[model samples]
Target chain A: VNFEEVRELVPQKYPFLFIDKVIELQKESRIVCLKNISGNEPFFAGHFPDFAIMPGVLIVEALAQASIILFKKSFKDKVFLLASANVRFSKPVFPGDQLILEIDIEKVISSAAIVKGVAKVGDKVVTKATLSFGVANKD
Target chain B: FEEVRELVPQKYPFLFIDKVIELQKESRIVCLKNISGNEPFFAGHFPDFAIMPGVLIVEALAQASIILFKKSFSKVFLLASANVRFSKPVFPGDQLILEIDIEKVISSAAIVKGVAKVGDKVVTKATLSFGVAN
Candidate 1:
């Protein structure tokens, strides 16, 4: 899906719309998206005048958004909220690399979901996480 | 309260914590984030119902933990994170307060307890781990 198409399904907007396009998605199963890094990525100012590393939390944040896109695409009626996560980050990312967001839906039910998210840069595991997102009460 | 740059290395757009309101080294640090409407994530987060992302709250706590550890600066990296729970939603115009306690602490990769609040209501609780990247 293209950026506009993804934007139609997900409410997230620019500066926050980290995912450029959805290259692979299986509705209820998995999603693989892309994020292109630039030397001017704004956060590089203090994150490291020394290095061009992306914030570890921002990597997880990117995963969070992808998880939302995956969940909402499958079940359109519910609102999703991140409940908890266990995440570990690797230190191999830098500006000018295309980071891949790969998310797998382990399970989902009436009120909750379990998913595994892995972020990578050409097979290098940038981050691996197990995340749970909760559904809002019915409106 | 002003010189946050002297501590951690996070700048605008990505910098979550704004200023240090309260501090007690070797113990706890209280920092604040003014959830402005102009914040980048707020623009697209919900479009209309823009609630602050949960992880940003966690991110705020992580920054505060770094401040507490540094007095808190240095090249600190978030090694891992676990057990972060949200009790309330943060909106634009709310003052998101982040407090991190290291009563159960270390420097050789520390694990700290975090609580975030807005007004009298508590927002999130998190367990964050950090290491000296440099």
Candidate 2:
């Protein structure tokens, strides 16, 4: 699918859009995508005056949001709560880096899904985590 | 608001909200931000995908706590520290509706509770404590 289809599938918009392109997708099992980094970003202006690095929290956010998209597609009309996550950041992502992220559903309960995800830049693994989201009635 | 930013020097990549939208002199404050994709942190944050970080969620809460304390007590205070348990992820497009309520305040210490919601979903919540630093 294209950017528009991906946007429609996930409830996110510009500035917040984490997934640049969808490389692979399966409604219930997995997702793989990319994010292209550039120096023209606003946060770079102040994160460091002499050195620039992509903050680690956003990396985890990207992984979690993508997991949301996959979860939505797999379980339509259902909502999930991020139950927990254990994340590790291995390296600092610099401008001009292209991140490759992959996520897979490990298990599913009546209203929750356990997921495992990883992010890499070329040969280096930037972050990885195991997370669980609990689904519940919207109302 | 001026008394709050002093509590935490949110340099850049960690700064969450740009400004305070409303303040009740220490009881509560409503802070908000309009995120754009052009943010610099988005670049390396996920070169191919950009999502707002979870720690920043707590960062925003910390900043809001400063505001809530100053407004409620009419005096400058310090963020003693906090232990946050984030329940969900917050994205850029998601308008962070921060609701900070002061739970108690003493001569040199205070406690506050925070809840962040997006369209009725409790994305994150925490109870933070602060102390009057001399």
Candidate 3:
């Protein structure tokens, strides 16, 4: 799916749209998506003078977005909020690279879900996180 | 917070945290990172005059999120990011101080609000959401 469809499903906007396309989705099992990082990306200009790599935090954000899709697809109309995460970055993600995010649901309850995710570029692990989300009533 | 990096997974070039000056549990977190000229982006971000992008200011804020969540919760992962805005430019050689605090947590997700400051000026601020996986 694209950002337009994503907009209908989630509450996020420009500079925060972590997914460019959904490559695969497997119910509550797994999710894979792409995040194309460009040198023209507003963040690339000043991260450094000679080295501009995609920030680690954004990689985590991209993973979070993928996890959100997994939770929402399983439980529609239920708002999910981020509760906790344990993340690590093994390598730097540079511009012109595609961030491939993989998320697997570990467990789920009526009000929350536990998941494990990672961001990678061809064989290199850029970031990983163990995260959970809570289901809440829409206010 | 340097030890926090061992728990999390961000490495060189992508690693946002350079050091942690102080962290007060769920109350607040103060950390520092230097924008060096050796960063790879400095090559093209501006081959002429290097200037850190505003978005990095927000990224710095994200590093603060890692500190807040790890210090406050048992363990969790990144879930979402919202209301993130950049207010200023972060250039090479600038020492960025990231300050973040836990606003609230519901079930599996967390809300962390933070600010990246240079000297006494605020450079970026945002409220980030996190979720646990694995």
Q: Give the better candidate number (1 or 3) by DockQ.
A: 1
- lDDT digits (tens) for residues A1-139 of candidate 2: 2544566676666566676667788878999877755433555555765565777777887888889878776763777788898998888886546677789999988887899999999999989988888977777
Q: Please give, for residues B24-79, the per-residue lDDT of candidate 3 as tens digits.
A: 87677787765543355654566545567666667667766776667666664774
| Docking model 2 quality class | incorrect
Ranked candidates (DockQ, high to low): 2, 1, 3
User: What CA root-mean-square deviation does each model show from the true structure?
Assistant: 17.2, 16.2, 20.0
Model 3 / residue B38 / CA error / Å = 26
Candidate 1 C-alpha lDDT tens digits along A1-139: 2655666666765556566567798989999977755433466565766655678887888888889988877663768899988999876676545678999999887888999999998868989999999988678
Query: What's the lDDT for residue B96 in model 3?
Result: 74
Report iRMS (Å) of candidate 1: 11.8
Q: How badly does each model clash, as a count of residue pairs?
A: 3, 19, 46
Clashing pairs in model 1, backbone N/Cα/C closer than 3 A: A13-B44, A46-B9, B67-B72
- Point to the candidate with the largest TM-score: 1
Kept native contacts, fraction for each prediction: 0.09, 0.11, 0.00
